[PDB]
Symmetry: C2
Subunit: 153 residues, 2 copies
């Protein structure tokens, strides 16, 4: 699968479309789109383990972390597969997204298709926030918006 | 035993949770759950090719038919991978689903995780409708409600 897409929606105004492209199965995944509805500033941006929205975003569960590592930022060696850092919303609540990542995949064991992309309430402190929660979830707060990542044309 | 789940939703009152379970890679896929908000009677229940909701259910595209077969019913040899037949709404609009299918899969070429389950407007005529369309789509009409099939716990 070389393309994927996620429609983010949640209980308040957070909504967005995030596209994923991996033209090479052992290359990086391009991640791109916009999210609006957002308080200006930095927002956690993570792959959670499950594509389960039966009870809203809480259902997705934890980060996708198949290898059982500590939470870190996308550029760290010590991180979850799902740790994609923070997106930044401008003064207008619009976050334009442009990421490449070489940990997540569109195939194989690091495959995120069928899982959940979640935009969070506050900044992921990237494991450098000074408390025990930081090295688990990065303290990014609640789940504003989520959507199961799906195969795209 | 890999597991999957779809939360089905649309512009209307139709809402559902459909669950998937395949205890063996080659095993049959057991699919159970509920859908409410339906007119009494049968509605077509189809897996469509994409997990794309950028435009509502339309963007899921056509039935998932990797083998270029003709539309038929779940019990037919000539059918799409996606052709799961019809679910039945009681007169209170509730359709308790309990299917078992051996053409869909949670693994492999015929993997449906990341694609889109859809419940349609009308009965699927199962390719036995007597017109050109019957054998393309099954005359099931509009997509009432769909969800991306996601990995579940």
């Amino acid at each position: 699968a070389t393309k994927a897409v996620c429609v983010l929606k949640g209980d308040g105004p957070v909504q967005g479309i995030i596209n994923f492209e991996q033209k090479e199965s052992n290359g990086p995944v391009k991640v791109w789109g916009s999210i609006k509805g957002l308080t200006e500033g930095l927002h956690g941006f993570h792959v959670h383990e499950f594509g389960d929205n039966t009870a809203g975003c809480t259902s997705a569960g934890p980060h996708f972390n198949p290898l059982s590592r500590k939470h870190g930022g996308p550029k760290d060696e010590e991180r979850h597969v799902g740790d994609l850092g923070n997106v930044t919303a401008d003064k207008d609540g619009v976050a334009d997204v442009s990421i490449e990542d070489s940990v997540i995949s569109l195939s194989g064991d690091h495959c995120i298709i069928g899982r959940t992309l979640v935009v969070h309430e506050k900044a992921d402190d990237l494991g450098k926030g000074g408390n025990e929660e930081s090295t688990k979830t990065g303290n990014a707060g609640s789940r504003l918006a989520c959507g199961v990542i799906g195969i795209a044309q």
